[PDB]
Design a binder for this molecule. Structure first.
Ligand SMILES: Nc1nc2c(ncn2[C@@H]2O[C@H](COP(=O)(O)O)[C@@H](O)[C@H]2O)c(=O)[nH]1
Ligand SMILES: Nc1nc2c(ncn2[C@@H]2O[C@H](COP(=O)(O)O)[C@@H](O)[C@H]2O)c(=O)[nH]1
Ligand SMILES: [Cl-]
Ligand SMILES: [Cl-]
Ligand SMILES: [Cl-]
Ligand SMILES: [K+]
Ligand SMILES: [K+]
Ligand SMILES: [K+]
Ligand SMILES: [K+]
Ligand SMILES: [K+]
Lengths: 109, 107
């Protein structure tokens, strides 16, 4: 299997198979409701979320990058913020869609 | 949008993503040569090897939303573990460390 950062989740190799379970810890992802976790890029509204992911150039250009070492190895750390356009005609739906998936695991039944 | 921009010799890292610096939403990555070249940089493929796919970006990161006087911001934090079994591991560690906070050494 490809290095983690190059994995593409789909129904056949889903979000928790490729990127681990959702949770509150620093090395855990917190994004994705039950539908997105199970479907990955097969998720119907996936393109509306992917529009906000950065290109390789923007990931290294916009982010604060670091290099940390832990008992498990060497990690490339990254942090940043992407400004949405609150004048985009779909701004209201984009906010609803992102929030729907942000910390969705906290209310899984 | 800014997150889909591609920096090149004609539209460099500073023009596309702002000057490097120490602040929280300020990019700190790139020596003068990478800032000048962007994706045209001699070792750009070795750097792009660490950039996440859209799926890994939303799968690995801690995503949030912050609404302030400047707008609505999608925040992100995470860490990508290097594979110490990758034959390029030594070069990857040296290359990343070279460009992290390189701006501190020049105007
Ligand atoms: N750091 C950062 N600045 C941004 C982003 N989007 C827009 N800006 C800033 O927003 C300001 C207003 O310009 P505009 O948004 O109309 O292009 C600019 O000075 C620009 O740098 C973003 O995602 N990140
Ligand atoms: N959160 C996180 N865990 C990772 C990453 N790469 C590997 N791991 C985890 O690190 C452990 C060691 O696996 P290895 O990749 O060294 O065979 C496993 O628990 C694996 O899931 C990564 O980029 N992020
Ligand atoms: Cl561009
Ligand atoms: Cl190269
Ligand atoms: Cl060098
Ligand atoms: K989970
Ligand atoms: K790119
Ligand atoms: K460290
Ligand atoms: K939408
Ligand atoms: K993808």
């Amino acid at each position: 299997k490809k290095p983690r950062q190059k994995r593409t989740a789909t129904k056949a190799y889903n979000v928790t198979q490729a990127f681990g379970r959702r949770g509150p810890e620093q090395t855990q992802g917190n994004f994705g409701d039950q539908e997105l976790i199970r479907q990955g890029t097969d998720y119907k509204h996936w393109p509306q979320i992917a529009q906000f992911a950065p290109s390789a150039s923007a990931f290294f250009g916009m982010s604060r990058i670091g290099m940390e070492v832990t008992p498990s190895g060497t990690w490339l750390t990254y942090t940043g913020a992407i400004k949405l356009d609150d004048k985009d005609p779909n701004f209201k739906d984009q906010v609803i869609l992102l929030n729907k998936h942000i910390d969705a695991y906290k209310t899984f039944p």
